[PDB]
Short mmCIF file of C-alpha atoms in Angstrom, two decimals:
data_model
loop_
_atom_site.label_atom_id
_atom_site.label_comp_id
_atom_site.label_asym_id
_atom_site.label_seq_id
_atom_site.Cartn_x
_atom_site.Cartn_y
_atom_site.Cartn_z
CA UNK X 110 24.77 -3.72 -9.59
CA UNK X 111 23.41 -2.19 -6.32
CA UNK X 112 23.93 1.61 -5.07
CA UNK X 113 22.97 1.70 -1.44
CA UNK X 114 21.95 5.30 -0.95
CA UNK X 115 20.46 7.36 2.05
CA UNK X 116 16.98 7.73 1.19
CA UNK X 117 16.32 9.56 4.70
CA UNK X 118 19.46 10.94 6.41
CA UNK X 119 19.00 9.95 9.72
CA UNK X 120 20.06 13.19 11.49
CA UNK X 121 17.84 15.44 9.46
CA UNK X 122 14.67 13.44 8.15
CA UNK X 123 12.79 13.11 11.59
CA UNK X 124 13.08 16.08 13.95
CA UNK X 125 10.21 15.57 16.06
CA UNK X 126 10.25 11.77 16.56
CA UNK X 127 12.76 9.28 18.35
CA UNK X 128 15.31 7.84 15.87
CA UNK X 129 17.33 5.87 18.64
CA UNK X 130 15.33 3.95 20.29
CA UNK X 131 14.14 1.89 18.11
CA UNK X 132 16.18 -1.40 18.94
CA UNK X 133 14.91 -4.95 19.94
CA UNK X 134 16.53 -7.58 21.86
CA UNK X 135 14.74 -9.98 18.35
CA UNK X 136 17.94 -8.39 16.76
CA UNK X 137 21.00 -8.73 19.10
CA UNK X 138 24.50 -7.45 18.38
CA UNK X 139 27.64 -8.87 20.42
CA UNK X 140 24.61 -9.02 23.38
CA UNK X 141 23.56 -5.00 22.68
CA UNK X 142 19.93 -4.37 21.31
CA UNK X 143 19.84 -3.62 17.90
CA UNK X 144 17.98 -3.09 15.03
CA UNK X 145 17.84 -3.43 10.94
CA UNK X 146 20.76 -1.38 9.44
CA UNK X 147 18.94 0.12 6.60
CA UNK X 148 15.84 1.07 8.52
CA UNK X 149 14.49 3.15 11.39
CA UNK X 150 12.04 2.54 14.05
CA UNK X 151 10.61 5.70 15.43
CA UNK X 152 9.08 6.16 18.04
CA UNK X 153 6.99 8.84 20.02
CA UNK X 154 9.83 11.81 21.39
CA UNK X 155 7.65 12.74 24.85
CA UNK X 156 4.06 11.90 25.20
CA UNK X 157 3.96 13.09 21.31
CA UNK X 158 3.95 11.28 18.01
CA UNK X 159 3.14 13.97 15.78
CA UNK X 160 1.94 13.30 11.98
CA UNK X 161 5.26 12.04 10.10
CA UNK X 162 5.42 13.11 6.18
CA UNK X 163 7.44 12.82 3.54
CA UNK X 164 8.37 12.78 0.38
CA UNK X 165 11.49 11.26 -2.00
CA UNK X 166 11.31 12.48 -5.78
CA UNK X 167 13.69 10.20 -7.54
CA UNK X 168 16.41 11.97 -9.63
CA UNK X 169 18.83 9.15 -10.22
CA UNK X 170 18.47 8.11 -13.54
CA UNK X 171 17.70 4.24 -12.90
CA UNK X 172 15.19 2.32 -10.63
CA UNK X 173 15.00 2.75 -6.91
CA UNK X 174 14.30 -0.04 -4.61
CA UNK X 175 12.82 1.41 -0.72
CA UNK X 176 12.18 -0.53 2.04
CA UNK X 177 9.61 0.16 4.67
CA UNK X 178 8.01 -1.58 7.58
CA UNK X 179 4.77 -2.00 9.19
CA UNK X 180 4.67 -2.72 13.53
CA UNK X 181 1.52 -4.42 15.42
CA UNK X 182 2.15 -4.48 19.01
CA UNK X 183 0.87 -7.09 21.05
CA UNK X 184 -1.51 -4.82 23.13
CA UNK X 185 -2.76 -1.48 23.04
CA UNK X 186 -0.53 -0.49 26.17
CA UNK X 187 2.32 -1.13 23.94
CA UNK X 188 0.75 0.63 21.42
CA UNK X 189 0.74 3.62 23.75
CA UNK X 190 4.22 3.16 25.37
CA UNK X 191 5.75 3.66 21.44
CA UNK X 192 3.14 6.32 20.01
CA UNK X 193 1.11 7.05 22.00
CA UNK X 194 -1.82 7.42 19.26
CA UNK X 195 -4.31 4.59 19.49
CA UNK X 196 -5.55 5.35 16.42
CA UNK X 197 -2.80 5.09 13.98
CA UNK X 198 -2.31 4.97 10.33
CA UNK X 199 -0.07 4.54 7.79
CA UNK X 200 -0.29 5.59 4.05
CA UNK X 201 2.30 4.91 1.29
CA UNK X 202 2.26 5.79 -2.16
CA UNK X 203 3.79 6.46 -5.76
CA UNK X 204 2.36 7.05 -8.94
CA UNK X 205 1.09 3.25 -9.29
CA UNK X 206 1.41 2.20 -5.31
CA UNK X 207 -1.13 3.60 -2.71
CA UNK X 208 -1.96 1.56 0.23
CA UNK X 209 -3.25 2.54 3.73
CA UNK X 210 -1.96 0.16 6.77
CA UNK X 211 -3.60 -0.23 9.85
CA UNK X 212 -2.32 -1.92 12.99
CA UNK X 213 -3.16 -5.10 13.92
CA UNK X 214 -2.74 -5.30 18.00
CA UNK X 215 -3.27 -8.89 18.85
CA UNK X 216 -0.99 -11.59 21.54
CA UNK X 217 0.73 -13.72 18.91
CA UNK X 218 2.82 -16.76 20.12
CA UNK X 219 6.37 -15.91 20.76
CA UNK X 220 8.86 -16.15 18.00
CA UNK X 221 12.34 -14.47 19.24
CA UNK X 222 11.05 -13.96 22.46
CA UNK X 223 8.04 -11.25 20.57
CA UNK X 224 4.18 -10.94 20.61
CA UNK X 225 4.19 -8.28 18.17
CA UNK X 226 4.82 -8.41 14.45
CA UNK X 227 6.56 -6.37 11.66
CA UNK X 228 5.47 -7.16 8.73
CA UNK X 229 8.06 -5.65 5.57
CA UNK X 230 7.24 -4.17 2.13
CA UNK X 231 9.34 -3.53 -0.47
CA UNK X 232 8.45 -1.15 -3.59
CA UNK X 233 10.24 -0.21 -7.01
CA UNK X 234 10.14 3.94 -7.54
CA UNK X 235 10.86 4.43 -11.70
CA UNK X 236 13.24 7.62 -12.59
CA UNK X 237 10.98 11.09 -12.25
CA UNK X 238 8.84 9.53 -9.60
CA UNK X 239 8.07 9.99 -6.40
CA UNK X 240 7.37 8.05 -3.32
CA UNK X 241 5.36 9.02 -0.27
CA UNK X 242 5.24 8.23 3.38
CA UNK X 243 2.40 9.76 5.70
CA UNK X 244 1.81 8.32 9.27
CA UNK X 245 0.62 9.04 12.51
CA UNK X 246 2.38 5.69 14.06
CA UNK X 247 3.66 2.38 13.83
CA UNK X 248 6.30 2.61 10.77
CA UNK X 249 9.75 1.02 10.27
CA UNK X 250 11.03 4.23 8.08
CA UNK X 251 13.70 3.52 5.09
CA UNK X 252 17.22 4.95 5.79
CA UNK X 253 18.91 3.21 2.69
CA UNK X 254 17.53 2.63 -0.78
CA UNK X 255 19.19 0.80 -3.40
CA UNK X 256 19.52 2.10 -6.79
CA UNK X 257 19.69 -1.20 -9.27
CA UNK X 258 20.74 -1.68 -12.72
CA UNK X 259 19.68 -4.49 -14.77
CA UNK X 260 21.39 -6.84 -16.76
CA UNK X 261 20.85 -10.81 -17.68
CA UNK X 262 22.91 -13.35 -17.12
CA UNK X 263 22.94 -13.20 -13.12
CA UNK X 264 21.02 -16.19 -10.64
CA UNK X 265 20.47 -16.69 -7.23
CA UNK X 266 21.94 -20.26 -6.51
CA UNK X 267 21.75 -22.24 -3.03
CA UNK X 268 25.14 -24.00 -3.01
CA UNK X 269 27.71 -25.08 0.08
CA UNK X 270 30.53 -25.05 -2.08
CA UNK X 271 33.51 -23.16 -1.10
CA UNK X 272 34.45 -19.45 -3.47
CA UNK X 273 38.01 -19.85 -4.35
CA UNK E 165 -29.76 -6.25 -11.34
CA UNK E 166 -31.45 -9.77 -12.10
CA UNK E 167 -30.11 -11.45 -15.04
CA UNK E 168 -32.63 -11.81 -17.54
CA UNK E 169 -30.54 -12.52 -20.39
CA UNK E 170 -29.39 -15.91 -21.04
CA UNK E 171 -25.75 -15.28 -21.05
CA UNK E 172 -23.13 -14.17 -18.86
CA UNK E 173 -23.03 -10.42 -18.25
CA UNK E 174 -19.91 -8.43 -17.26
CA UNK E 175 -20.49 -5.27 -15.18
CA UNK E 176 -18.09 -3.16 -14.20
CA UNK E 177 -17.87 -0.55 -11.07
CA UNK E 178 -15.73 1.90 -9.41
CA UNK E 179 -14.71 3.38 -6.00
CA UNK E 180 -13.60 6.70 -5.25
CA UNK E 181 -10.59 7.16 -2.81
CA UNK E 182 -10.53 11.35 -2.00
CA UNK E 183 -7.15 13.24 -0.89
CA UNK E 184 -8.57 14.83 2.23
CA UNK E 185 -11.53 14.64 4.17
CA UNK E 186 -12.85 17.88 2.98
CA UNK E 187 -13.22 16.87 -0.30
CA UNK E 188 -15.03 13.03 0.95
CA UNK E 189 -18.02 15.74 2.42
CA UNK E 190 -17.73 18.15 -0.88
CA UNK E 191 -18.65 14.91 -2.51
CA UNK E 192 -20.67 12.43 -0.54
CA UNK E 193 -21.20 14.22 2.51
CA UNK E 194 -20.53 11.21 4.99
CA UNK E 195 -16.96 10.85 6.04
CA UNK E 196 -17.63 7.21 7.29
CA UNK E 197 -18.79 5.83 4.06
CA UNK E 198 -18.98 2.07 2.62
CA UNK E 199 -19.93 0.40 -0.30
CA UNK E 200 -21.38 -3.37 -0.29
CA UNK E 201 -21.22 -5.17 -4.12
CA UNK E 202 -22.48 -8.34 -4.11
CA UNK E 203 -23.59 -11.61 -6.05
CA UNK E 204 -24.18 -15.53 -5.28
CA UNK E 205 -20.50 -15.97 -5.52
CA UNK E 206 -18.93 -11.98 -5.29
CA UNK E 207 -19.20 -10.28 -2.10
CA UNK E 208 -17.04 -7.35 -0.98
CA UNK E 209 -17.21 -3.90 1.05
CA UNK E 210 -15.07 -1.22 0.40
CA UNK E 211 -13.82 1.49 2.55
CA UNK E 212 -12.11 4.53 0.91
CA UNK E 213 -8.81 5.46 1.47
CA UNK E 214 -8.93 9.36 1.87
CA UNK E 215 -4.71 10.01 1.62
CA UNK E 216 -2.72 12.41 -0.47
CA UNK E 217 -0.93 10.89 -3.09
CA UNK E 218 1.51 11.87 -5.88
CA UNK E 219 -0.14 13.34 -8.38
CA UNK E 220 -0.37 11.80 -11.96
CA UNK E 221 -2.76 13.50 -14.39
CA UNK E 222 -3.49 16.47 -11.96
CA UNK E 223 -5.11 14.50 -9.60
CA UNK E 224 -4.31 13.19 -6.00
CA UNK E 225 -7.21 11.07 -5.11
CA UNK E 226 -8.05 7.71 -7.39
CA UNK E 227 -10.23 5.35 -8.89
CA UNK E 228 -10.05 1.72 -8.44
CA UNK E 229 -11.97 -0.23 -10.81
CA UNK E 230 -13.52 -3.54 -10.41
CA UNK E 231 -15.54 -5.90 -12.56
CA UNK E 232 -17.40 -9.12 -12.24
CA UNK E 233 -19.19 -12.00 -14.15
CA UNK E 234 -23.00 -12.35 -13.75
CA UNK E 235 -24.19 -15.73 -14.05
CA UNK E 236 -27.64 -16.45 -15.53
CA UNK E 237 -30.21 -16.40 -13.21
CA UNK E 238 -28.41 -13.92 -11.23
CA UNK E 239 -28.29 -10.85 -9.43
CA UNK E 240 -25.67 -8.30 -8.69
CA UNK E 241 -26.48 -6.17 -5.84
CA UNK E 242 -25.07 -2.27 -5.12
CA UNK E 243 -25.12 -0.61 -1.67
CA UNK E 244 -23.25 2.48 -1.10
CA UNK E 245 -23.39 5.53 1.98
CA UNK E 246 -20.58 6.94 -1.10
CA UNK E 247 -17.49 6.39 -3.01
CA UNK E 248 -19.52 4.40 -5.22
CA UNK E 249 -19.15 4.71 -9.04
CA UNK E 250 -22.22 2.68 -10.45
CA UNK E 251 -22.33 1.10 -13.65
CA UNK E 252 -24.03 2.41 -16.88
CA UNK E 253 -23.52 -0.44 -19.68
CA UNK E 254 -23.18 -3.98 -19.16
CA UNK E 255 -21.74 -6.50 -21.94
CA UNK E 256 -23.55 -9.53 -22.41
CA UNK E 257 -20.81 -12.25 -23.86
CA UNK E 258 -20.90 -14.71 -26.03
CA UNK E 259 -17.64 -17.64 -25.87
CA UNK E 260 -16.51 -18.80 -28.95
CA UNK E 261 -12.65 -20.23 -28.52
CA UNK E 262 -10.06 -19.25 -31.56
CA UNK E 263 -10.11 -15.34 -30.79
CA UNK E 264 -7.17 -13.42 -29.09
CA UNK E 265 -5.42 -9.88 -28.56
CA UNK E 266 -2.30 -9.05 -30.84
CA UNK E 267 -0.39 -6.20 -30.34
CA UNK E 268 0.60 -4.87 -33.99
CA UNK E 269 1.60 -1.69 -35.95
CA UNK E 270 0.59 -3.49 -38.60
CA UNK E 271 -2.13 -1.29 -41.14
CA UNK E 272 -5.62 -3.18 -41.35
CA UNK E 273 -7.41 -4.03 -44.89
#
């Protein structure tokens, strides 16, 4: 089972940064620039990224699955065109995850037409705990976490057989 | 440390991550702080994390604790402007194959 929740309502979770124009021509949609459906890539709202934090205290009685991302532009110019801090961190933790990302701003060789990376972590948040997201730039925020339920008997098979 | 003894010697260390920066100068008093731990094989430097996290046993910084083998002959070196939580008691061990760890409710006589 899988229950794809909204972690961060879109329309209420960020009020000072960008939620909409975060889209990529690496992720296409009938010729539009898109982006990931179950995350958001913020970005400065006028000359200003303030310090983004929050918080998700899980009251659903099963595991949570959340879904973040990490972005290294290619050069510190870019760096500046999306948030305008330099300097930037990014800290994530729960009661058994803490980490602290910093950007890597380097010219990789294109892949889909990019320099930059985005590099994608994943965590597990256990019932009655909470998860944490502080930054001052360069994070792919969730939008949709998925509550899962376990059970055996299920397998991930690589097969070009039709479903009938 | 120079290993005197004939045997292998685990030591075991720590580094302090604080919530906020005021509490990294009520402590150490150096904001930009390191730590260098190092041996003919080991060598590491840690940098400490100063974030808020969620707090589990009342507390919101943390502890990460490392350990190493000392080889005889050798020496383990400590450097630290802070965030460094220096060992006390090392173990010198002796192999001996046919031991293990059992996890049992099981009443000992």
């Amino acid at each position: 089972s899988f229950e794809r929740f909204e972690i961060f309502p879109k329309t209420s979770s960020w009020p000072n940064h960008d939620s909409d124009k975060g889209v990529t021509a690496a992720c296409p949609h009938a010729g539009a620039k898109s982006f990931y459906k179950n995350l958001i890539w913020l970005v400065k709202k006028g000359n200003s990224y303030p310090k983004l934090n929050q918080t998700y205290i899980n009251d659903k009685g099963k595991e949570v699955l959340v879904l973040w991302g990490i972005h290294h532009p290619p050069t510190i110019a870019a760096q500046e065109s999306l948030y305008q801090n330099a300097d930037a961190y990014v800290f994530v933790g729960t009661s058994r995850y803490s980490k602290k990302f910093k950007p890597e701003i380097a010219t990789r060789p294109k892949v889909r037409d990019q320099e930059g990376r985005m590099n994608y972590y994943w965590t597990l948040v256990e019932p009655g705990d909470k998860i944490t997201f502080e930054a001052t730039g360069n994070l792919v925020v969730p939008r949709y976490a998925f509550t899962m339920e376990r059970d055996a008997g299920s397998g991930i098979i690589i097969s070009d057989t039709p479903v009938h």
